[PDB]
Design a protein around this ligand. Structure first.
Ligand SMILES: Nc1cc(Br)ccn1
Length: 129
């Protein structure tokens, strides 16, 4: 894409230790599956393209970007050591939306619907075995 967008968050690095856990499997098979297919997922399925959206200040304000396309790759390509890393990525994505946008903007309402589903699913995150 454009040189004016930052490189996306890391999704591959052999030096980072990796693990499969039952919790990370739940995050892929239950949490990501649920949110990815939601009617309101589409703004969150890839990094924000601030050039295409004409938001030149986006990456001036958002210095810790995250999106569900990145999270999907991280889950599918076993990037994580634990569930907390992945939950933090979802929380970062939601907070980016809430910080950048006005409350009640359409994307904020969309994020809030996804976050409500996320919370329900994370409250049922299984005990680590
Ligand atoms: N100068 C710029 C930068 C971005 Br990113 C988008 C539009 N104009």
């Amino acid at each position: 894409g454009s040189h004016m967008n930052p490189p996306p968050p890391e999704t591959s690095n052999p030096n980072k230790p990796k693990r499969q856990t039952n919790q990370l499997q739940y995050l892929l098979r239950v949490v990501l599956k649920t949110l990815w297919k939601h009617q309101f997922a589409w703004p969150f399925q890839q990094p924000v393209d601030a050039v295409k959206l004409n938001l030149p200040d986006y990456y001036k304000i958002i210095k810790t970007p995250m999106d569900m396309g990145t999270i999907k790759k991280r889950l599918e390509n076993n990037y994580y050591w634990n569930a907390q890393e992945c939950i933090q990525d979802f929380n970062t994505m939601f907070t980016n939306c809430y910080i950048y946008n006005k409350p009640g903007d359409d994307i904020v309402l969309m994020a809030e619907a996804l976050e409500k589903l996320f919370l329900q699913k994370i409250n049922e995150l299984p005990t680590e075995e």
